[PDB]
């Protein structure tokens, strides 16, 4: 997270850390007790998922859980076309027990509103080029479809939306993939991609447009 600040501890209790061999590679978002949503580009054959964290070290975080997961369901049309449909559902080996620090978040049924200021959180790169110790939070502004298309054509697709690009250089960056973008208190997007480098004025990042996938998500959960 570029130009954010420490999240209030446990204020984003749906945040999931995706780690393997003890190193973070993406985040995800708890959307039901047994289900973590993440970007499809974060797919691996198995996962160790950290829930209830603030720092990434579970042994330093009361109430946290490191849950195993082997099964994930990529959206079947992920990357067809390229970068589109960037979501997957990770099935935890067992349901979590939701608590004060581990909680699912409702997914937006309505699509992003241009100009909305939405919160993004993660343990990805900071403005100073380092990785944070604790979860970072920043707000970014949803950009119109018209501008998103101009920047990202011909790969722009309605499974995507743009946010950020402000003079403030607030953005998500490497390590933030798969984590949440929250508008109106609902999960609106997942961190997906951008033009390198992160934080360019006038070049918003791109997020998975979850309002397009609520049916697919629940179909997967119920099947």
């Amino acid at each position: 997270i570029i130009n954010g600040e420490d999240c209030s501890p446990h204020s984003q209790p749906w945040q999931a850390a995706l780690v393997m061999e003890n190193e973070l590679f993406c985040s995800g978002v708890l959307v039901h007790p047994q289900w973590v949503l993440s970007a499809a580009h974060c797919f691996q054959n198995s996962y160790t998922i950290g829930l209830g964290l603030h720092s990434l070290e579970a042994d330093q975080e009361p109430g946290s859980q490191m849950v195993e997961a082997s099964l994930s369901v990529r959206h079947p049309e992920y990357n067809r076309p390229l970068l589109a449909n960037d979501l997957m559902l990770i099935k935890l080996d067992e349901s979590v027990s939701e608590s004060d620090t581990i909680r699912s978040i409702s997914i937006a049924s309505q699509c992003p509103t241009a100009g909305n200021s939405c919160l993004v959180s993660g343990w990805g790169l900071l403005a100073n080029g380092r990785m944070p110790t604790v979860l970072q939070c920043v707000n970014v502004s949803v950009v119109s479809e018209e501008v998103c298309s101009k920047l990202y054509d011909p790969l722009y697709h309605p499974s995507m939306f743009c946010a950020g690009g402000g003079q403030d250089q607030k953005d998500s960056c490497n390590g933030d993939s798969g984590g949440p973008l929250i508008c109106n208190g609902y999960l609106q997007g997942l961190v997906s991609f951008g033009k390198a480098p992160c934080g360019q004025v006038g070049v918003p990042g791109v997020y998975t447009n979850l309002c397009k996938f609520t049916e697919w998500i629940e179909k997967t959960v119920q099947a």
Partner: peptide, 13 residues
């Protein structure tokens, strides 16, 4: 230069 925000980034321009 369209890169995902994973570690490492997956870069597709």
């Amino acid at each position: 230069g369209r890169c995902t925000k994973s570690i490492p980034p997956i870069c597709f321009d």
